[PDB]
Design a protein around this ligand. Structure first.
Ligand SMILES: CCCCCCCCCCCCCCCCCC(=O)OC[C@H](COP(=O)([O-])OCC(O)COP(=O)([O-])OC[C@@H](COC(=O)CCCCCCCCCCCCCCCCC)OC(=O)CCCCCCCCCCCCCCCCC)OC(=O)CCCCCCCCCCCCCCCCC
Ligand SMILES: CCCCCCCCCCCCCCCCCC(=O)OC[C@H](COP(=O)([O-])OCC(O)COP(=O)([O-])OC[C@@H](COC(=O)CCCCCCCCCCCCCCCCC)OC(=O)CCCCCCCCCCCCCCCCC)OC(=O)CCCCCCCCCCCCCCCCC
Ligand SMILES: CCCCCCCCCCCCCCCCCC(=O)OC[C@H](COP(=O)([O-])OC[C@H](O)COP(=O)([O-])OC[C@H](COC(=O)CCCCCCCCCCCCCCCCC)OC(=O)CCCCCCCCCCCCCCCCC)OC(=O)CCCCCCCCCCCCCCCCC
Ligand SMILES: CCCCCCCCCCCCCCCCCC(=O)OC[C@H](COP(=O)([O-])OCC[N+](C)(C)C)OC(=O)CCCCCCCCCCCCCCCCC
Ligand SMILES: CCCCCCCCCCCCCCCCCC(=O)OC[C@H](COP(=O)([O-])OCC[N+](C)(C)C)OC(=O)CCCCCCCCCCCCCCCCC
Ligand SMILES: CCCCCCCCCCCCCCCCCC(=O)OC[C@H](COP(=O)(O)OCCN)OC(=O)CCCCCCCCCCCCCCCCC
Ligand SMILES: CCCCCCCCCCCCCCCCCC(=O)OC[C@H](COP(=O)(O)OCCN)OC(=O)CCCCCCCCCCCCCCCCC
Ligand SMILES: CCCCCCCCCCCCCCCCCC(=O)OC[C@H](COP(=O)(O)OCCN)OC(=O)CCCCCCCCCCCCCCCCC
Ligand SMILES: CCCCCCCCCCCCCCCCCC(=O)OC[C@H](COP(=O)(O)OCCN)OC(=O)CCCCCCCCCCCCCCCCC
Lengths: 171, 105, 47, 80, 169, 120, 347, 104, 48, 98
């Protein structure tokens, strides 16, 4: 069959978010509050194209808006955030419930110096609508033409011509 | 004597476990969901006789998704040629195929 | 049709019932011989 | 029925406690006002990803941001 | 070697089946089926069937083979050529199959078989905050309603049937 | 053979298009033969229990006759329905495929040469 | 047995058969066969003698082996198709194993070696259930998997079943073994026409169940398990000799009887597909079935064997048995050939 | 992996204890000592089969703590109470037909 | 690697479709070392 | 196909040919039957976990439950045979030759 088409290694170069999972999980609610639009453009493009090769520019926009988010944390509230993700980072399950005072300090400093509001319980699982400029994928499964169906039955049902026609049975 | 009582009464006794492309708990996709969906939506309504000779490509893609025989045969060819070139000394493995390049994310 | 192989075959019983074709005996003693220790019991147990 | 109940509670109280606990387990969730909230909490637990919708132009109930007013809410769960 | 762990456990599995299926005695046959059930459980566990492997240990080895050894103890007496000969026959057939599918990375007895480690065929993604195997088993109560009805009816009928045929009257 | 026809609508003994067909008359010789089978079942039922064969249980003989006629009427309706379905599918398949059913150029016996084999 | 428990266990037998007949999933097919065997085991052990325990053990071993081969065929189908719909099988190995498993469940030759032993070991009512109702579910699965059934396999099983069920009944004097070898020959007749027209398969199965139900009901009503005990029936109830005469003449395939209907329709649908040698050899082989049927008619109805003195006491008592549907089944097994185009209701 | 290491270590310590307990009392040479079917019960087999069938019913009951998380709770609760009820009905039929007798 | 091999299409799909197929474990970690293979393919199962 | 499927199917056939060739004991026959079930369990489980076919995760449990109830039925048959003949030998089950 055909040759698979892959992007070059230059097209896969982006400035990664080289932080740990507790750094992300500590920042995850404000990240979902603030980096909404490129993330949902990317996930809409990702569930519609069904191909990670058509989604690389939205992936780079996600990977860029996340860096802008952490730079904007780093300019104002580096120390409460650092204490908070260290407390998140101690726990083996990384519990939010063990870390409520450091979360309170980080949310206080984030609401004061950046105006960011933490999402309530129920908001980051809402289904949101995304305004895109890319076209809707018209055949994302790359399905070929379906076979034409068998003909339907039509007409009125007449009696059997001379009955059963089983050897001599005249009905 | 397939007495299709389920389609007669409208009950769903076992149509849910019948295929991989059905409704799954927590919307978990099967690893060959698209291939099975393509083969079923091809072969739907045209019968077995037309489905074996008109939907052959979709069923071959789906069987090769399931069993991965051509994929494993292709990897066997590449790996055997690689090991022959390593034994002959005419090929070197790159550092990113030896654990020396500080992986992506 | 009688043969040499099917020669010893008799017909089955008329009610299709065949003949059936015991109980345990225990030589018993007290577990720790502190109290009694000098008892012998020949049981006939039925399970 | 009061003589039989006291008699079976005198003779076989383990079976009376068995049938009483089993009968409460059967008829009690249809009488409880919190059986609704079990369904409400299980359908509100977000296992999958909330795959967003293409904004065609007419979806007034769907929010554009998670912190928008419209959309499904869990204030009943915070409060109870 | 360590990438072939499921394969090596499957070789131990076939060796255990050649062990008990050559039938030395129902006691040692039970022992061979116990060791075989344990290593086949390990085969299932190394794909991510942790609940299904614990179902092997808890149900298969835990109840059923215990009842087999129990009933054997009531029907055999406590105190050959054909068993050991059939044992080494099955062992040589299995090792010749191993040798072919290892030196060739390919064999065909009834179907074509790969010779690489079966690590190759796995998925490269996650399941999130659940096990897919656990959620599919949990759906026996919400999706498998008819399946639960016929399974419970067969088990109740099975209790009735065992009390009928062991009654003797 | 016709199992894909009655698979869109399963377990219908008489479909709605069976009503376009004329029902069997109640003086159908097939249905009268089934009534004769009911009378014979009544006679065998009086004979195996050593009742008088023609006299005993006239209510029972009449219920035998009635029950066989009642079942056989719907059996004849389904029989005529399935043969009508068979002819309907035959004619629609011939109509949809004219290349597989060419209208045969019929020659008369003045052009047809048949080899004569004498009996002598 | 408790009559409540008897009714529940027979409903569970029927339930397993219905679950095989209605379900669209292979696991539920296997579940139906498991439930069917699990429920029919007490019916075979109804009288609790060592022949019934031996018969139930042999039946258990054969049906268990067939159920495990059925599940292996289902598992190879799940490999090579990724799904579970009860339809054609997507691998010839799964098709071979499932055809073997259903051949073991039907007791077709060369997997026939349990049917006369198990039928002899059990009573006449349980033998009736085994030889009529237990044929329904595997023929339904064969009816559904026929786009994948290998032709040479099913016709080998068919002609081997017809030949071995012909030669097996010629040596028999026990009635249950005669009915079992009759079963093997008629299952060969059913599966021979399966890939050609399965409506005629269902016609053969229905006429066979009617005639076998008639013969087992006559054998129950006369309480005769051997040829020579059936020979005393003329001095006890002479109408029963007439009924077993016409039913044995029907099962031999003689016109104008309705046992000629299935084999005539099978020959009729096998000559359409340009097979001439095979229905001719099948028809000539069925003359052996007719031979031991005529042996039984000679011993029962056409001659008068010697009776004993104690039959005079049994003259003074009527049959108080529920001869359920015996006149209906006797009429349907003999006088149905004028209604031969009724077979279209099974289309 | 760590599980396999732990199983091998427990098996090794157990085999070492068994090998010591068989070979360490063979050090002291002792005076070599020169002087000098079972009955079936139906109830013993029946309690084992009753165990096996109720254990299969338990095998059906084991996915319940995962099954409560479903969105089809009314069907789930119905089938859960139905499996426990069929286990209780198996126990009641085992009771009333003299099955739990002399090993009650 | 596959230069000396005659008739070899590099990057040839084993599927007739042009749809993106999710890669297999052997397609990604096929040419890499056995330690990375084990850590990617049995790591979560063997984790503690 | 995959390499482990060869060994699991060969395990099924080994327990098959064990079950199809009796030595003396009916218990060893039932052991071979449940070894067939064990190999079927493992093979179905490896397919269903490999495919990520979620709903068929309950299939091997239903297989295990039905076939262990079947095994209980077979053990009760063996127990009745052993109470008849004293042993569980398959050469004692030969009354139905005539
Ligand atoms: C009709 C046919 C079926 C009748 C079955 C019952 C026969 C019976 O009991 O007869 C006795 C009875 C008189 O006897 P009885 O005095 O009451 O007491 C009986 C004695 O006790 C009898 O004495 P015994 O029993 O003490 O001992 C003598 C012994 C004598 O027996 C022996 O010695 C044993 C046998 C000897 C050798 C075999 C000879 C042949 C017998 C069988 C026939 C085989 C060939 C059949 C065809 C070939 C294919 C196989 O047994 C008998 O005679 C028993 C009685 C039965 C004799 C007749 C048998 C009939 C059944 C078989 C033929 C019909 C079914 C098969 C048809 C197949 C396809 C055509 O006979 C009749 O009444 C005959 C019927 C006459 C009136 C007919 C009216 C017809 C009206 C039609 C229109 C109305 C209906 C409209 C319906 C439609 C509405 C829309
Ligand atoms: C549709 C398919 C129907 C299949 C057969 C259904 C009945 C048999 C299954 C159950 C059973 O064994 O019941 C006993 C069975 C009698 O069989 P048996 O044990 O040989 O009794 C013989 C003596 O006549 C028993 O006499 P007895 O002294 O004890 O009492 C007299 C009895 C008293 O009657 C009653 O008690 C009936 C009134 C109450 C009914 C139930 C209400 C609840 O009346 C009768 O038995 C008269 C004969 C009734 C006809 C039997 C055969 C029915 C036709 C089978 C299909 C034939 C198709 C031929 C097709 C040919 C072309 C292919 O049936 C009845 O007692 C009632 C039959 C009602 C027939 C309705 C037909 C249309 C249904 C729609
Ligand atoms: C205003 C509203 C009301 C208006 C009312 C208008 C009518 C007024 C009269 C009402 C009564 C009508 C009765 C039925 C009409 C006549 C049917 C007829 O004769 O068909 C000729 C039919 C074909 O001849 P056709 O010259 O082409 O047609 C003349 C008509 O146009 C025939 O017309 P078709 O072309 O429409 O015929 C249709 C087709 C024409 O037939 C065919 O296409 C050929 C296939 C026929 C069956 C071949 C089966 C071969 C294997 C079985 C051999 C059986 C051997 C004989 C019996 C042995 C002992 C049981 O027949 C069938 O498919 C039915 C099957 C045969 C049953 C015939 C009716 C019997 C009713 C009474 C039964 C009593 C027992 C009789 C013996 C049982 C056996 C018949 O010939 C035969 O079937 C030969 C046998 C004779 C039939 C029975 C004669 C009826 C009267 C019997 C009274 C005497 C009973 C004696 C005591 C009991 C026996 C011991
Ligand atoms: C770690 C958990 C606890 C483990 C156990 C405790 C640790 C100690 C283990 C060693 C105990 C002492 C040696 C074994 C006992 C010897 C007793 C005895 O009667 O020996 C006589 C025996 C035999 O003495 P004998 O030759 O006079 O024989 C007497 C019997 N007749 C005459 C009838 C033949 O002595 C030995 O065999 C010597 C054994 C080795 C001596 C110790 C070496 C170092 C062991 C470490
Ligand atoms: C004995 C009968 C016990 C079950 C009673 C009904 C239980 C129930 O909630 O069923 C709904 C369930 C499920 O219905 P549901 O409403 O949950 O369906 C929604 C769709 N899914 C499952 C995808 C979420 O079952 C059915 O509707 C059909 C299966 C059972 C049909 C009846 C069997 C009767 C057996 C008699 C023998
Ligand atoms: C409706 C909800 C769901 C119900 C089903 C679920 C039940 C869960 C519990 C499982 C129980 C399993 C075993 C049941 C066996 C019942 C039969 C029984 O035990 O009968 C025998 C007993 C007498 O005991 P005996 O045989 O003598 O014991 C030897 C020592 N003497 O006989 C007796 O003691 C009499 C037993 C019958 C009467 C019991 C009445 C209890 C009433 C409690 C309050 C009402 C609860 C609602 C249920 C309706 C009860 C009528
Ligand atoms: C006496 C029989 C009375 C039958 C009453 C109606 C029963 C019913 O609903 O039957 C449905 C069935 C037609 O259903 P269908 O989809 O054609 O079956 C496919 C089978 N391969 O209809 C039939 O099968 C009708 C014929 C049944 C005849 C049984 C006795 C011969
Ligand atoms: C595509 C097909 C779909 C399905 C179509 C329908 C298939 C029907 C298959 C019928 C199979 C019948 C098997 C036998 C009945 C089962 C229950 C039973 O065993 O009843 C007999 C009963 C038991 O009583 P018991 O006391 O235990 O017996 C010892 C004698 N004292 O009582 C006795 O022993 C008394 C003696 C008389 C028993 C006569 C029973 C006749 C039942 C069958 C009637 C004919 C079948 C229906 C018509 C044809 C349908 C195709
Ligand atoms: C070719 C067809 C057979 C393929 C496998 C062959 C394996 C080697 C055995 C050959 C036959 C040996 C034999 O005589 O077996 C009979 C034996 C039962 O006989 P027993 O009671 O032990 O002793 C009396 C002697 N008749 O029966 C047994 O010992 C049965 C043991 C069967 C176990 C099979 C093990 C795997 C075999 C290879 C894979 C298949």
């Amino acid at each position: 069959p055909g040759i698979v088409e892959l992007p070059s290694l230059e097209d896969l170069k982006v400035q990664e978010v080289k932080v740990s999972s507790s750094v992300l999980k500590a920042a995850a609610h404000h990240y979902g509050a603030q980096c909404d639009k490129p993330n949902k453009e990317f996930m809409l493009c990702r569930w519609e194209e069904k191909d990670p090769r058509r989604c690389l520019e939205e992936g780079k926009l996600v990977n860029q808006c996340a860096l802008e988010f952490f730079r904007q944390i780093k300019r104002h509230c580096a120390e409460p955030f650092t204490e908070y993700w260290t407390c998140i980072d101690y726990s083996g399950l990384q519990l939010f419930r063990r870390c409520r005072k450091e979360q309170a300090q980080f949310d206080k400093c984030v609401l004061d110096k950046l105006g960011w509001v933490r999402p309530d319980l129920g908001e980051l699982s809402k289904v949101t609508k995304v305004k895109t400029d890319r076209p809707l994928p018209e055949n994302p499964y790359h399905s070929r033409a379906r076979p034409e169906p068998n003909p339907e039955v039509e007409g009125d049902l007449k009696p059997a011509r001379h009955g059963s026609r089983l050897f001599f049975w005249t009905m | 004597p397939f007495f299709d009582v389920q389609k007669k009464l409208g009950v769903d006794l076992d149509h849910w476990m019948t295929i991989q492309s059905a409704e799954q708990p927590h919307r978990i996709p099967a690893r060959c969901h698209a291939f099975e969906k393509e083969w079923i939506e091809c072969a739907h309504g045209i019968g077995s006789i037309r489905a074996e000779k008109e939907c052959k490509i979709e069923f071959e893609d789906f069987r090769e998704c399931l069993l991965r025989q051509k994929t494993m045969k292709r990897l066997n060819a590449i790996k055997r040629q690689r090991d022959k070139l390593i034994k002959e000394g005419k090929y070197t493995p790159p550092p990113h195929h030896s654990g020396q390049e500080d992986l992506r994310p | 049709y009688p043969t040499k192989e099917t020669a010893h075959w008799k017909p089955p019983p008329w009610n299709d019932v065949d003949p059936p074709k015991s109980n345990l005996t225990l030589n018993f003693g007290p577990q720790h011989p502190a109290a009694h220790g000098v008892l012998r019991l020949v049981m006939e147990l039925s399970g | 029925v009061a003589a039989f109940l006291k008699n079976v509670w005198a003779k076989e109280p383990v079976l009376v406690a068995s049938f009483a606990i089993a009968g409460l387990a059967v008829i009690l969730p249809t009488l409880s006002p919190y059986t609704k909230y079990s369904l409400m909490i299980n359908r509100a637990t977000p296992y999958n990803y909330p795959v967003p919708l293409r904004d065609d132009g007419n979806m007034p109930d769907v929010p554009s941001h998670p912190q928008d007013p419209q959309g499904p809410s869990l204030e009943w769960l915070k409060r109870l | 070697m360590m990438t072939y762990i499921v394969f090596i456990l499957s070789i131990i599995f076939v060796m255990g089946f050649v062990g008990f299926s050559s039938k030395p005695s129902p006691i040692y046959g039970g022992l061979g089926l116990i060791v075989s059930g344990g290593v086949g459980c390990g085969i299932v566990l190394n794909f991510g069937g942790s609940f299904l492997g614990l179902m092997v240990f808890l149900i298969y080895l835990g109840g059923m083979m215990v009842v087999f050894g129990y009933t054997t103890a009531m029907a055999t007496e406590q105190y050959n050529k054909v068993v050991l000969g059939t044992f080494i026959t099955g062992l040589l057939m299995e090792f010749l199959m191993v040798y072919y599918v290892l030196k060739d990375k390919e064999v065909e007895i009834v179907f074509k078989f790969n010779g690489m480690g079966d690590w190759v065929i796995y998925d490269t993604g996650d399941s999130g905050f659940f096990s897919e195997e656990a959620m599919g088993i949990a759906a026996l109560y919400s999706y498998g309603t008819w399946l639960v009805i016929v399974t419970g009816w067969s088990l109740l009928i099975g209790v009735v049937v065992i009390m009928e045929i062991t009654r003797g009257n | 053979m016709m199992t894909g026809r009655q698979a869109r609508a399963p377990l219908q003994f008489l479909p709605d298009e069976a009503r376009s067909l004329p029902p069997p008359k109640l003086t159908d010789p097939r249905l009268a033969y089934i009534g004769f089978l009911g009378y014979c079942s009544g006679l065998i039922d009086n004979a195996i229990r050593r009742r008088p064969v023609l006299s005993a249980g006239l209510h029972r003989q009449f219920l035998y006759i009635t029950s066989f006629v009642f079942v056989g009427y719907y059996l004849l309706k389904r029989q005529d329905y399935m043969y009508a379905v068979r002819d309907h599918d035959m004619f629609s398949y011939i109509k949809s495929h004219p290349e597989d059913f060419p209208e045969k150029d019929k020659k008369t016996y003045r052009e047809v040469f048949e080899e004569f084999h004498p009996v002598r | 047995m408790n009559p409540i428990i008897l009714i529940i266990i027979l409903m569970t037998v029927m339930l397993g058969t219905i679950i095989v007949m209605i379900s669209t999933h292979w696991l539920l097919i296997w579940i139906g066969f498991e439930m069917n065997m699990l429920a029919i085991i007490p019916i075979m052990m109804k009288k609790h003698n060592p022949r019934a325990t031996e018969a139930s053990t042999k039946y258990f071993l054969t049906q268990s082996t067939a159920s495990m081969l059925l599940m292996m065929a289902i598992i190879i189908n799940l490999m090579f198709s990724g799904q579970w719909t009860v339809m054609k099988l997507f691998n010839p190995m799964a098709s071979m194993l499932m055809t073997m498993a259903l051949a073991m469940k039907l007791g077709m030759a060369p997997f026939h070696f349990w049917v006369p032993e198990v039928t002899q070991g059990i009573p006449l009512s349980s033998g009736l259930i085994l030889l009529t109702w237990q044929k329904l579910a595997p023929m339904s699965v064969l009816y559904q998997i026929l786009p994948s059934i290998n032709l040479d396999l099913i016709l080998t099983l068919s002609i081997l079943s017809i030949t071995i069920g012909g030669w097996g009944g010629l040596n028999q004097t026990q009635l249950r073994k005669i009915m079992a070898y009759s079963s093997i020959a008629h299952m060969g007749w059913m599966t021979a026409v399966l890939l050609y027209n399965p409506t005629m398969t269902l016609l053969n199965l229905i006429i066979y169940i009617i005639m076998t139900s008639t013969m087992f009901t006559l054998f129950m009503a006369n309480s005769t398990t051997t040829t020579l005990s059936l020979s005393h029936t003329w001095n006890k109830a002479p109408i029963m000799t007439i009924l077993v005469l016409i039913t044995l003449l029907s099962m031999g395939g003689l016109p104008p009887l309705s046992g000629f209907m299935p084999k005539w329709m099978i020959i009729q649908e096998m000559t359409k597909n340009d097979s001439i040698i095979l229905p001719t050899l099948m028809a000539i082989t069925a003359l052996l079935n007719l031979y031991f049927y005529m042996r039984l008619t000679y011993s029962t109805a056409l001659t008068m064997f010697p009776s004993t003195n104690n039959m005079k006491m049994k003259w003074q008592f009527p049959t108080t048995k529920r001869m359920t549907l015996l006149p209906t089944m006797t009429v349907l097994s003999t006088m149905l050939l004028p209604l031969t185009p009724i077979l279209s209701i099974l289309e | 992996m760590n599980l396999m290491i732990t199983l091998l270590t427990n098996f090794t310590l157990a085999t070492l204890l068994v090998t010591i307990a068989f070979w360490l009392p063979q050090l002291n040479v002792y005076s070599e000592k020169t002087s000098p079917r079972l009955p079936f019960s139906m109830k013993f087999f029946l309690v084992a089969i009753t165990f096996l069938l109720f254990d299969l019913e338990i095998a059906l009951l084991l996915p319940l703590p995962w099954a409560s998380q479903t969105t089809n709770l009314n069907t789930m609760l119905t089938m859960a109470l139905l499996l426990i009820f069929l286990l209780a009905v198996s126990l009641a039929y085992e009771w009333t037909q003299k099955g739990l007798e002399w090993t009650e | 690697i596959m230069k000396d091999v005659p008739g070899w299409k590099v990057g040839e799909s084993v599927f007739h479709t042009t749809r993106w197929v999710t890669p297999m474990m052997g397609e990604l970690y096929g040419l890499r070392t056995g330690e990375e293979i084990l850590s990617s393919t049995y790591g979560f199962i063997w984790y503690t | 196909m995959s390499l482990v499927y060869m060994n699991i199917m060969m395990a099924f056939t080994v327990s098959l040919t064990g079950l199809l060739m009796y030595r003396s004991h009916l218990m060893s026959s039932l052991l071979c039957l449940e070894g067939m079930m064990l190999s079927l369990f493992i093979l179905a489980t490896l397919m269903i976990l490999n495919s990520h076919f979620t709903l068929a995760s309950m299939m091997p449990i239903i297989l295990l439950v039905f076939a262990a109830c079947e095994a209980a039925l077979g053990l009760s048959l063996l127990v009745m045979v052993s109470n008849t003949y004293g042993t569980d030998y398959v050469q004692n089950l030969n009354l139905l030759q005539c």
